[PDB]
Amino acid sequence: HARSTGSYSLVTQQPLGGKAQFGGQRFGEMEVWALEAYGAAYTLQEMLTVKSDDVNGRTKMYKNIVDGNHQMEPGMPESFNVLLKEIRSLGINIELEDE
Amino acid sequence: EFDAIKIALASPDMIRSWSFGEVKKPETINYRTFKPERDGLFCARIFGPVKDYECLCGKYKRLKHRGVICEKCGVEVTQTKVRRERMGHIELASPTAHIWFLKSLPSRIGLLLDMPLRDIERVLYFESYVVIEGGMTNLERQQILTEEQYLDALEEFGDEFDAKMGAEAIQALLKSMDLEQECEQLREELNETNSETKRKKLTKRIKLLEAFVQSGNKPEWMILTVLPVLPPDLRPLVPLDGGRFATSDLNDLYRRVINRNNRLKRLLDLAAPDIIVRNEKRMLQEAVDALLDNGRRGRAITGSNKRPLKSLADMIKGKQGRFRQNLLGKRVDYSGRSVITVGPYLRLHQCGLPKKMALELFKPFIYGKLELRGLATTIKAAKKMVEREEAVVWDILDEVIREHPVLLNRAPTLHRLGIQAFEPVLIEGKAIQLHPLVCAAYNADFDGDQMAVHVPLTLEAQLEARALMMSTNNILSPANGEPIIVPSQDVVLGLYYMTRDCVNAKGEGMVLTGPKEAERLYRSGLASLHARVKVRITEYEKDANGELVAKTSLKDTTVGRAILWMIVPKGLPYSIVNQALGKKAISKMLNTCYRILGLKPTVIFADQIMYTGFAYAARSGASVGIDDMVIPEKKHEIISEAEAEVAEIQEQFQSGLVTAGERYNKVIDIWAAANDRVSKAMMDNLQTETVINRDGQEEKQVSFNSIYMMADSGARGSAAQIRQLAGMRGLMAKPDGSIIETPITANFREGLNVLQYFISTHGARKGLADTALKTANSGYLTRRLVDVAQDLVVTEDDCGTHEGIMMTPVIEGGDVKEPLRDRVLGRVTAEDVLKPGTADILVPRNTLLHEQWCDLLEENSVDAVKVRSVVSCDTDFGVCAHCYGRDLARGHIINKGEAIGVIAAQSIGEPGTQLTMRSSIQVKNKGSIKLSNVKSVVNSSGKLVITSRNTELKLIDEFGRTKESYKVPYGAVLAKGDGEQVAGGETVANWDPHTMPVITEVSGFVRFTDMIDGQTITRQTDELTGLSSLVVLDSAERTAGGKDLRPALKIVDAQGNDVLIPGTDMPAQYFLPGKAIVQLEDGVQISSGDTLARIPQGGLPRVADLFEARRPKEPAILAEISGIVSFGKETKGKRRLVITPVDGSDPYEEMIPKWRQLNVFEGERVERGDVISDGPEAPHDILRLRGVHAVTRYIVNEVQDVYRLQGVKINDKHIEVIVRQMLRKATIVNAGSSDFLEGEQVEYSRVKIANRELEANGKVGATYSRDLLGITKASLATESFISAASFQETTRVLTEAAVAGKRDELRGLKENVIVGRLIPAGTGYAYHQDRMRRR
DNA sequence: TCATATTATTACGCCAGACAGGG
DNA sequence: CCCTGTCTGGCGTCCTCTCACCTATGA
RNA sequence: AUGUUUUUUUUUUUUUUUGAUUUGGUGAGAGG
Ligand SMILES: [Zn+2]
Ligand SMILES: [Zn+2]
Secondary structure, three states: OEEOOOOOOOOOEEEOOOOOOOOOOOHHHHHHHHHHOOOOOOHHHHHHHHHHOOOOHHHHHHHHHOOOOOOOOOOOOOHHHHHHHHHHHHEEOOOOOOO | OOOOOOEEEHHHHHHHHEEEEEEEEEEOOOOOOOOOOOOOOOOOOOOOOOOOOOOOOOOOOOOOOOOOEEEEEOOOOOOOOOOOOOOOEEEEEEEEEEEOOOOOOOOOOOOOOOOOOOHHHHHOOOOEEEEEEOOEEEEEOEEEEEEHHHHHHHOOOOOOEEOOOHHHHHHHHHHOOHHHHHHHHHHHOOOOOOOOOHHHHHHHHHHHOOOOOOOOOOOOOOEEEOOOOOOHHHHOOOOOOOOEEOOOHHHHHHHHHHHHHHHHHHHHHHHOOHHHHHHHHHHHHHHHHHHHHHOOOOOOOEOOOEEOOOOOHHOOOOOOOOHHHHHHHHOEEOOOOEEOOOOOOOOOOEEEEEEEHHHHOOHHHHHHHHHHOOOOHHHHHHHHHHHHOOOOOHHHHHHHOOOOEEEEEEOOOHHHHEEEEEEEEOOOOOEEEOOOOHHHOOOOOOOEEEEEEEOOOHHHHHHHHHHOEEOOOEEEEEOOOEEEOOOOHHHHHHHHHHHOOOOOOOOOOEEEEHHHHHHHHHOOOOOOOOOOEEEEEEEOOOOOOOOOOOEEEEEEEEEHHHHOOOOOOOOHHHOOOOOOOOOOOHHHHHHHHHHHHHOHHHHHHHHHHHHHHHHHHHHHOOOOOOOOOOOOOOOHHHHHHHHHHHHHHHHHOOOOOHHHEEEEEEEHHHHHHHHHHHHHHHHHHHHHOOEOOOOOOEEOOOOOHHHOOOOOOOOOOHHHHHHHHHOOOOEEOOOOOOOOOOOOOOOOOOOOOHHHHHHHHHHHHHHHHHHHHHHHHHHHHOOOOOHHOOOOOEEEOOOOOOOOEEEEEEOOOOOOOOOOHOOOOOOEEEOOOEEEEOOEEOOOOOOOOOHHHHHHHHHHHOOEEEEEOOOHHHOOEEEEEHHHEEEOOOOEEOOOEEEHHHHHHHHHHHHOOOOOOOOOEEEEOOOOOEOOOOOOOEOOOOOOEOOOOOEEEEEEEEOOOOOEEEEOOOOOOOOOOOEOOOOOOOEOOOOOOOOOOOOEEEOOOEEEEEEOEEEEEEEEEEOOOOOEEEEEEOOOOOOOOOOOOEEEEEEOOOOOOOOOOOOEEEEOOOEOOOOOOOOOOOOOOEOOOOOOOOOOOOOHHHHHOOOOOOOOOOOOOOOOEEEEEEEEOOOEOEEEEEEOOOOOOOEEEEEEEOOOOOOOOOOOOOOOOOOOOOOOOOHHHHHOOOOOHHHHHHHHHHHHHHHHOOOOOOHHHHHHHHHHHOOEEEEEOOOOOOOOOOOOOEEEEHHHHEEEEEEOOOOOOEEEOOOOHHHHHHHOOOOOOOOOOOOHHHHHHHHHHHHHHEEOOOHHHHHHHHOOOOOOOOOOHHHHHHHHHOO
C-alpha cells in the first residue's frame, strides 16, 4: 500500500487509516521518539505538520512541490486546535500568549 | 509567533466572550430532510452556514455580499471550517460545580473550604444544607445542617438566618472567602503549631490558597454557570452507509443537559414546590457532571446498549485521547507499507522499493517533473498520464528517485536504529528489498514482517535523511560501543567455512606468490578452500603519523585466509584473518577497522564481507542432515548408571533410611551430573570427531560436521540447543516452579514419547506466556523512561566543575567481573589521574579517555578513575558536553544539541524484552591481603578477629589494582592478617552465622550483671549432652514485674574492679539481647575471640522497582545521626531506639518494628550511612544519608546487575542520566533570605539559580535538600503541564495547572511535538538559540 | 411521526494515597 | 496521638489486516 | 450606337467559471 494524497477524516485533519480506505501510515509515538533521538527536527516537523495535519501547510506544500520548490510553510497542527477547543469546552481557559 | 501556553479558570464573562450564541433547544436536526434546527444545538445564527458563503435557507449564491443576515434565514455568511472554531454556551438554570475541582483527589474545593469530600457531595446532591453567614445564632460557617437540624433551626432562628444547599450555597461560600485573610491565618497557624500531621495538612492548604491569589483565578469560577459547548465540527454528525445518522456521544450529553435545563426553567416559571425543583436541579447537576467527566460519579450513563458513552474528559485522557492518539502520533501522507524480503545485491546505503509504491509515493515530484519538461500542460493531464502509466513516466521516476532518501521503519520501533534512511533502487515486484546486515538493527527477520516507507518532502528533511539517518551513518549502536552492522548468520558460516583448515587437502603445503593466485588455484580446481599453504602477503601497517608502511612477508596460512585477505583494506594487519573467524572475531574485525581506518573503508568493507560470506556459503553447500547429530555411544550406559543410582536411592526409601527432601535432592543431583556427562560425551563426539590421516598415521582436528560449524561459528545455535538435539534434554520443570525428578532422557533425534513431550509443553507454554505478557511491561517501561527524560538536551560545553563519580571495576566476590576499561571508556576525567607510582600527571584533568588512553591506563594498572558523571553536572536546564562523555556511535564528544535523554531512555528500555520476568570465604587467586573498615583485635590463639561488622576484605595483587573483595561479619576467625601474602585456594576467613559472637576486647573474669534465673534468664539443662547453659529470655516472654531487667556481662579483673576499654574510662559491658543462650558461665576467665552468648536466628520488575523507586517490604533501617545508641519503651506498637551524638544534639530517635534481627548493641556508636538491621535498602535513605553519588552508584550497580545477569551491554551514561531525572526535585530546609517557604518542594535548578543570583550579592543563600522522586511521580511533577499531561492522568494535572494558573514556557521536546514546531534538540537547536537570543 | 428522557451482576494485581480506629 | 487495616483510584505494548453490528416508543 | 431594362426580404446572440469528487464509536479474530 502507498499514499501520496487522497481523503482524511472529519473530526481531525489527519489522513484515514487502512487499505480499504486509501490511507497513510500511522507515524506513532515511538517513531517520534526515534526521530527525537537523532537530530531529525525538520523531518519530524514535516512529519507531524505538513504531511499530516496542517491544512494550509499541506496545500502550500503540494503547490510548492509541483512548482519545484521543496520548502514547507509549517503553521500549527489542526488537531492541537481541536485539543484547545475540547479543553476550552470545559471550564478551562487555555490560551496562546505574546508574540 | 507565540511563546508560552497559559491555562487558567474560565470566568462567565470569559465564556460569554468565547461564545457566538446561546444554544437553547436540544433538537439536533430535522432528520427527515437535511436541514438542522433553528435554533437548536446545531444552529445557523449562533454558529455559521453549513455551505461555504451561502445562506443555507436562501440568498447570496455568488461572491459579493458576504455577511448579510436576513430575517428569513437567521444565518451568518462565512467558510465551511468556521463552525469548527466557533463554540456555543448553555445558560444553566441552576448552578453546577465542576467535577474536576470537586473530585480530583485531592479535590480543589475540598482543601480550600476546609470541608470533607463526603460532606461536600451530600450538600451538592441536595441531601444536606450548608450555613452561610447566619448571624447572631449558635452555628458555624462550615458546619452543615440536615433536615432535622434545619427544621428546628427554621422555627428557632426564623429571622437573620441563611442556610442554602447545592452549588449555589457552595458558590457563595467560595465567593465570600477572603483569600488574603486566610493566608495570614494559615501562616500564623503553621508557625504556632508543632503537630507534624497538622503541619503538612496546613502547608498543603496554604499552598493552594496563596497560589490562587498570585493568579487571576477567582474562587467563584469553580462552579459552572455558563456551560460551554464544543463546536459541531468537533462533534461531527455523519451518517454511515445507509439512511440513519450515527450520532456522537457528546450530542447525547449536550442534548440531555439542554432538555433538563429547559425543564428547570419551566418549573421555576411555574413555581413548583421544593422537592420537585431539588430533584430537577439535582438531575441537572448530575447531567453536567456526566457531560464533563462521565463515570467519575456513580455508575456511568449509557445509550447503546450497556456500554457507557464517551465524554469530553474521555476525549482528552487515556490511550486514545488527543495527546497519545492525534498529537504525539499522527497518520501521515506520502507513506507506504509492504512485506519485506532480502535482496542481497544491495549496498548498505540503499534498499529496494517497488515500482508501484514508487509511482504512488512520488506523485507530486513526477507531476512537477512532467510540467517542467513540457510534455503536458495542466495538472489534470499529468494525473491522467500517471493514471494510465505511459512509457515516459518511468524515466521521470528514475529521475526523481536518484538522490532522494526514504525512511524505512519497522513497526515496533524500540530504539533509534529502527528508523533508517536509504536510497531507493526500483524493484519489479511488490516487496521491499532490505539489505541483510541492516536487519540486525531492525530486529527484522523475514518470516512475514512488514515495514513502512516515509518520504522526506522538504529539502532540510532530505539532508537530515542523508546526513543523520542514513544507514551508513548508523554502524554503532548508541547504547554502547558495539557495532550494529555485525554480520548475522549466513555470512559468518561462509567465513567460518572459508577461513579454516584441514590436515590434508588438495595443495597441502605448496607455496604461493600472492593472494591473487590463491583465488586462481581455488577457482581452477587445483587446491581446496582450506589447505594450509605458505603465501606471500603484503600487509600495510601505518606505524608513522598517517603514513602507510608496506611490509611483505610469507605467512603460513591457508588458501581461504589469503582469499579473504584480498578484501581486507590496507591498514589492518594480517592476524585479523589468520584465525578461524567465528562471530565474535568478525565483529571485532569490523570494530578494529572502524577504530583504525574510519567510516568509509568500514562501510565498503562491511559490504565486501557480506558479499564474500554469501558467495562462499553458497559454494560451501553446508546442509543439515539426520546423520549430523551424532548420538554418543556412551549415552545409554550413562542412563543405565543413573537408573541404578535412582534404584539405590528408592531402595533406601522403601527402608526409610533417608528423608524425602534429601531423596528429591539426591535424584536432582544425579540427573544433573548425568546430564553434564552426556553433554560432555556428545561434545567430544562432535568437536573432534573427524580423524583423517595426512601422509601416514592418523591425526585429529576439529570437525567439519554441519551442526558443529553452525554452533562453533556462532551463526545459529549454542551449547544448549546442540545439546538438546544430541544429548538428553535435561530436567524440565512443571509450572509449580519446582523441578520434575524424572528427566527427559530422549533427545530430538530419538523420539520423544508422550509424557516427555507433555512435560516439554509445560516448559514451553510458560515461555510463550512470559514473552507475550512481558512485552507490555517492556513497552510501558520505555514510555515512562522517555517521558521522564523528554527535556534533557546537551546545552553547554563545560559546566566548570571538579566533581564526578569514582569509577572502580565492579567485583561481586568471584573473579573481577567488569573491568575498568569497560566503565571509563570515553568518559571525561574529573581531576587528573595520578600514575600509580608517585604523584605523576599521567593523564590531564579534562581529557576524553578513548582507546589509546585506556590502553595507557591498562599498562600502568590504574586503580580507579575519578570521572565526570551526568548527575554531577552543574548546568541549569541540560547537561554540559564534558559531563556526558563520548558520543557512542560517534567517536568524538557529544555535540552541542544531541538529545541524550531520549537515546538513553530508549537504550535502557529497549533490552526489556530480553530480560526475564518470572559458610565462610574461599579465595580463588593468589595475592596480597588488605582490610578496610576494620577495627580488630588479636585473640589468644593468634587469629585476628574483628570488632567491626562492616569490614571489607580486599585481595590486592602485586601490581596495585583491586582484584577481589568480600564482606566479613562482626567477630570472624581470620586465618590471615593485614598486608599479608597468601596462596591460591587457602581459606582466609571463618565464622558461624547461626551464633552471633559477643567476643570481647580485653580479658578478665565474668560476672552476671542483671542475670537472675527465674525472671531474666531460665534454666534449660541440655538433654543429650549434660553440659547445661543458662538460656537468656527475651523481653516478651518474661512478665511485667521483671521485664525492666536487662541481662548483661561485664568483664572485671582478678579482684573485681571493672577492666576499662583501652582508650576510654568506660567498662566493657555487653548487654545480652533476646533469644540468646549463655555459652561461657560464671567465673570463667575469657579472652578475645571467644563468644559470650549463642544467638540463633529479580529481572524486569527489579528494573521497574529501581527506576520507579518503590520501597521493599522490609527495608534495612539506618541511623540519621552518629553517636551512642540505646533502647526505649517496651512494646507499644514498636520498640524504641534513641541515638545521642557525642557532640551533636540528642533528640533524634526511631521506633523500630521489633520483628527484625538487629545488628547493633547498646555500647555501639553508629554513623550516618551505617546499617542497623539488614535486608534491602531504599534509595531515599541512601540519598538523605550517604550522598547523591552514593545513590547513583547504587542504581547503576543494581541495574547493571540485572542487565549483566541476562547479558546485555549498556553503558552507564544512560542510567546516570535517568538517575539525574529522578532526583531533580528538592525540598527546602532553611528558606534563608529568598522568597520560598519552609517545607516547600521546589525544583533544584530554580532554587540554585535563585540563591546563585542572591549569593553573588551580599546575601547568603538558601540551603536545600535533594529528594528522589520515582519516574512517574517525577515526570508528573514538572514545571510544564503539557509534558505532564501527554503522560499519565490528565485530569489531576489539568486541574492542578488550572487552579494554579500555570504557564508553559515550552522549552522541551514534547511541548514542541505537541504544538507543532521544531524540536529544541537536534537541527532545531540553532533555531532555538536564535529565538532565545532575539528576545 | 415527533417529542419522552434512563433499570434486573460478580471471576486482576499491584501500588500509592487518603481515612477512621485504637494503645 | 502515631501505627494501621481498609478502601478508593489509577496504571497496565506498539504497528497492521479481515469480518459483522448498530434505541424504543405510538396515539 | 446604347443601358439603374425584371426588382420581393432567400432576415443580426455566446456559453459563462466558480468552487469537489465525498465514509464516525463498540466488540471479536489473525500477522510481526
Ligand atoms: Zn440569507
Ligand atoms: Zn557538567
